Design a protein around this ligand. Structure first.
Ligand SMILES: [Mg+2]
Ligand SMILES: [Mg+2]
Ligand SMILES: [Mg+2]
Ligand SMILES: [Mg+2]
Ligand SMILES: [Mg+2]
Ligand SMILES: [Mg+2]
Ligand SMILES: [Mg+2]
Ligand SMILES: [Mg+2]
Ligand SMILES: [Mg+2]
Ligand SMILES: [Mg+2]
Ligand SMILES: [Mg+2]
Ligand SMILES: [Mg+2]
Ligand SMILES: [Mg+2]
Ligand SMILES: [Mg+2]
Ligand SMILES: [Zn+2]
Lengths: 55, 100, 196, 64
RNA sequence: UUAAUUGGAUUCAACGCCGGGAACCUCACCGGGGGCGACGGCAGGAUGAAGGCCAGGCUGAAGGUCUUGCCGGACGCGCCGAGAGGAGGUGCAUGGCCGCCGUCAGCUCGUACCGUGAGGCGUCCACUUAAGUGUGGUAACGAGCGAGACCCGCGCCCCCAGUUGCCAGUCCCUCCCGCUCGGGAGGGAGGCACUCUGGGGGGACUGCCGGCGAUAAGCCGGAGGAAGGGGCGGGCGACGGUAGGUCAGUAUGCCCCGAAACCCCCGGGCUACACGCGCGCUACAAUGGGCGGGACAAUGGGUGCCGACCCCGAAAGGGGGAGGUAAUCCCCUAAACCCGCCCUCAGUUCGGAUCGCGGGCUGCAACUCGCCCGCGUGAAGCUGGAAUCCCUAGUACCCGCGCGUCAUCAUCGCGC
């Protein structure tokens, strides 16, 4: 076929297996407790999720 | 013959309101209740670099989420069991009921 | 464990809220509320123009319900549309309105002054508006409008003041609009009264 | 430095004029009285106000 | 230097920084091979458009293409516009966010008054404060934002609560020693005393005493006290400037590429090496090295996972596998420290770089280019010029541990 020359392989580990669910970036993904967010995206949506800066 | 009730929430006031409702229900009848036991709080702490780029001094944010818990043990009585099954929690409280 | 459950719910609401905020922009979106019932999920949407949300005899409410069920994970959804409570005490709504007025073609000073006059008329202790971007030329600039009482630093500014931000896309580029409002019933720590 | 704050002074002076025969040279008595006569909700602010009122009472009793 | 060794940042305020520990991916670089044009129109097209394949060449490998002919029925990149997508240019076109000046004490307004005016005054003087923090005097009188207040944690006490946490006293059974008057250890009933967990409340105010200052604001020194003078440690950064950083996190104008600057696959590179520099780790030994034995933590984490317990192996590891969605089960019987013996000031029983041989684990793949174990090998280094950094109390030095990253890999980051 022809569309086979456009599909990516289904990776199970490595940096290529995880993307931010809000912007699609590869790299600095926060994996704690199942979050999948960049360090950039988490900073601006943290107050809505209920986190606070106590100290 | 005894039922175990677990509660959890991020808001400390709603937890106490639901627990007080249960305590009033139990007192409003003849039934023995093992008082609301406070279990250790869950803290979720996440530390992140602030700047989007890598230039400048390195500074950090420390975000925190706190989850409070309670534990109540009461003997299963049909007159009182229906009442505690009829009480409806606020949307930010989790409740689970089991038979031991 | 228990922590993983709480975090999972907060993310779904955030994703849905951002999707709707981008979607129902012309209707004056003002937040949402999600409730779970044994029969399914009740979703309340706050807006100032329910007619746009419903969309000419359905055909859009069903669209939203179906998308909410497929793209996101709500089970058995049921959407109800209501009216925003205090439109003039909501900073997000005011920011979006100012941005739309700018996109219409109105000069930014007139927009800002009209908005402040309305907000202060409807009974707020203070309001601040900041507008930044390429206003009047190709070198960018920021201007600021203010009147009333407004806290800025410390815990009371964290809990009492409402904040909102919006973008305005013009022909030359984007303009940023920021709004902060302090409600009428807010009380500061140093306001102490003698009982008679 | 231990500089007294402005609004503490203002509220304390208002209390002293309005109820002159209500406070003594005792700190505990004034603490309870201030707790009852205002809507102050912070424990620390209450202590500051009571201390200043005690000083006012001893100073006027001296006649300045 | 190279086919390429992709790019940003250069005093403080670039150089274990971009959460940058890159085998593939990441990826933007180099060699090579493939794929893609909504919507309009032109050629063409059921006398079948576009599209798909058993075998075999081409090829790194490929119905990609060719050979060989079979399958499918309606649109059409061979042509013209247009579009999708762009880690392509511009941070000197912008938004948002961040660093620094600086957690410094500043920046302003209403009315009056002074000056032709730009401006001034208030915001100045004296004393005081961490502070434009206060008290008096004043052509000023009054206000706003910042400071303080506020929010989280630690230290002392009281009430409520008793499980998955705790075990002192009392009771039953079993097993040990000096043979048991006495002293221990487990288990069961039983209790919430003590510790702990976490809701509420109390407690400290320059309140008391003596001085100085003005008799004011305050300062200095004492008692009592768990705590004494922002009680201690943190969060929160005003109006603005820096054409400071970021369009290579996302949003976005203009300019470009648009059958390649878009989308996939294979192999290389970012790991090169006469040399200059930053930050560290290991040492140069006795304030030690080795061998045997004895002690005492806290923070966190676990279902794509943590794994006790049994068996096999010299080790690294291998084969089974209880319990655990967790105050219950597991990671988890730390090191510095103490006791006994060997070595006696030496390039050594100091140091452990470099290299040979052999055995393992993760992974689709370990050569370029991973981590671990056994025997062998045994480099420089004997305390450091001119210079220069960090730190005021449970702080600095010394010692290990947890989490992030993570299939595997910690001389790093954040905490204990
Ligand atoms: Mg402050
Ligand atoms: Mg380079
Ligand atoms: Mg590596
Ligand atoms: Mg690579
Ligand atoms: Mg004049
Ligand atoms: Mg002057
Ligand atoms: Mg001030
Ligand atoms: Mg700039
Ligand atoms: Mg610049
Ligand atoms: Mg590199
Ligand atoms: Mg040795
Ligand atoms: Mg190798
Ligand atoms: Mg020597
Ligand atoms: Mg690193
Ligand atoms: Zn992101």
């Amino acid at each position: 076929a022809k569309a086979d020359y456009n599909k990516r392989k289904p990776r199970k580990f490595g940096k290529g297996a995880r993307r931010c669910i809000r912007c699609g970036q590869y790299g600095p993904i926060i994996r704690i407790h199942g979050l999948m967010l960049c360090r950039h995206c988490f900073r601006e949506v943290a107050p809505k999720l209920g986190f606070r800066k106590y100290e | 013959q005894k039922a175990r009730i677990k509660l959890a929430s991020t808001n400390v006031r709603s937890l106490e309101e639901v627990a007080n409702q249960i305590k009033q229900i139990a007192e409003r009848t003849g039934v023995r209740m093992s008082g609301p036991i406070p279990l250790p709080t869950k803290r979720i702490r996440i530390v992140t670099r602030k700047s989007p780029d890598g230039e400048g001094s390195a500074t950090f944010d420390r975000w925190e989420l706190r989850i409070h818990k309670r534990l109540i043990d009461i003997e299963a009585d049909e007159r009182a069991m229906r009442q505690i099954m009829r009480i409806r929690v606020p949307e930010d409280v989790t409740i689970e009921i089991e038979l031991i | 464990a228990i922590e993983r459950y709480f975090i999972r719910e907060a993310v779904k609401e955030m994703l849905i809220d951002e999707f709707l905020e981008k979607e129902l922009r012309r209707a004056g979106y003002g937040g949402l509320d999600i409730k779970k019932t044994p029969l399914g999920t009740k979703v309340i949407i706050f807006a100032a123009n329910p007619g746009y949300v419903i969309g000419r005899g359905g055909r859009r409410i069903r669209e939203l319900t179906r998308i909410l069920e497929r793209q996101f994970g709500l089970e058995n959804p049921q959407i109800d549309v209501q009216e925003i409570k205090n439109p003039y005490l909501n900073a997000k709504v005011q920011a979006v309105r100012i941005a739309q007025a700018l996109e219409r073609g109105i000069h930014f000073r007139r927009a800002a002054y009209a908005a402040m006059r309305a907000i202060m008329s409807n009974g707020a202790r203070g309001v601040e508006i900041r507008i930044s971007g390429k206003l009047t030329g190709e070198r960018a600039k920021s201007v600021r409008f203010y009147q009333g009482y407004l806290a800025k630093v410390g815990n009371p500014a964290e809990t009492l003041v409402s904040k909102g931000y919006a973008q305005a896309l013009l022909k030359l580029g984007v303009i940023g609009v920021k709004v902060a409002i302090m409600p009428p019933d807010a009380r500061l720590p140093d306001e102490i009264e003698i009982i008679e | 430095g231990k500089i007294r704050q402005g609004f503490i002074k203002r509220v304390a002076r208002e209390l002293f004029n309005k109820y002159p025969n209500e406070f003594t040279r005792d700190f505990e008595h004034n603490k309870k009285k201030v707790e009852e006569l205002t809507n102050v909700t912070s424990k620390k602010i209450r202590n500051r106000i009571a201390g200043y009122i005690t000083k006012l009472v001893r100073m006027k009793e001296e006649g300045k």
